[PDB]
Amino acid sequence: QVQLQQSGAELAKPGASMKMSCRASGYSFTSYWIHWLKQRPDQGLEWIGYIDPATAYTESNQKFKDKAILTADRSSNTAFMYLNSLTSEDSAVYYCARESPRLRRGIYYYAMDYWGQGTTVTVSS
Amino acid sequence: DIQMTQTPSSLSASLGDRVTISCRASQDISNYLNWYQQKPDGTVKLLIYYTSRLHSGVPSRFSGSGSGTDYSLTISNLEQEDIATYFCQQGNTLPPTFGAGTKLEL
Ligand SMILES: O=C(CO)N[C@H]1[C@H]([C@H](O)[C@H](O)CO)O[C@@](O[C@H]2[C@@H](O)[C@@H](CO)O[C@@H](O[C@H]3[C@H](O)[C@@H](O)[C@H](O)O[C@@H]3CO)[C@@H]2O)(C(=O)O)C[C@@H]1O
């Protein structure tokens, strides 16, 4: 059974940086991407980016190219997301999600088949 | 960026009903349309990928259809474990974008 255990809720200061983790168990961590997503109160999901643990390659949404940095530790089966220059606009629920098996070579569904429970971040003065 | 619009924003139904919700993409996404369910506690699960393909473990009462810019998710025999918010998401071009969601209530 595939599980993604995310880190606990953090209470961050404006302008500071923070780090959250996504622990993978029950599957080959290097065979699928890990997407990172953002959700605001009673709103839709924003896609931040994904990282390929096999190659450490990262693709990022332009809206987050200076806000988030995605890393993956192959040995510990863990994905990380570093946020910087925090603001109240960053107060949200952050999810990590596993990319489903591809349609064919080079063609991906971009369907996030397994999700972490989410990490709530509160940026407050 | 492809924009996804879901209708209606909220749908109230009863146990056992057959329910269908709509999702419109800004452009032709060539069936790369995925459906997600989100419970009140915050958990998210994939239901349908690639317009009509059922994810592992999802009951066959969930069905999907559509093409081009227009897609739909159908629930027959509504169970109480279906009361949640349902998001569609296109996977045709970077970046992946999600709809505003449809809250399916009793
Ligand atoms: O493309 C990606 C980027 O995340 N991921 C795909 C993975 C990935 O390529 C490999 O897991 C890396 O080792 O592959 C996926 O499909 C694999 C699956 O279909 C499997 C059979 O169940 O076969 C794999 O191919 C192997 C051949 O079967 C072997 O004969 C040959 O020796 O080695 C290849 C290399 O794996 C498929 O790769 C998956 O794991 O689901 C799809 C992912 O999208």
Residue numbers in the entry:
A (entry chain A): 1 to 52, 52A, 53 to 82, 82A, 82B, 82C, 83 to 100, 100A, ...
B (entry chain B): 1 to 106
Text taken from the publication that reported this structure:
14F7 is a monoclonal IgG1 with high clinical potential in cancer immunotherapy as it displays extraordinary specificity for NeuGc GM3, while it does not recognize the very similar, ubiquitous NeuAc GM3. In fact, the two glycolipids only differ by the presence of one additional oxygen atom (H to OH) present in NeuGc GM3.
Two of the four scFv molecules (M1 and M2, comprised of chains A + B and C + D, respectively) were well defined by electron density in the CDR regions and could be modeled without chain breaks, whereas parts of CDR H3 could not be traced in the remaining two scFv molecules M3 and M4 (chains E + F and G + H). Inspection of the ligand complex revealed that only the sialic acid component (NeuGc) of the trisaccharide interacts with the antibody, whereas the glucose moiety extends outwards toward the solvent, where it makes contacts with residues of scFv M3 within the same crystallographic asymmetric unit. In this binding mode, the glycosidic linkage between NeuGc and Gal adopts a synclinal conformation (also referred to as “-gauche”). Especially the possible replacement by Phe emphasizes the importance of the aromatic interaction with Wat1.
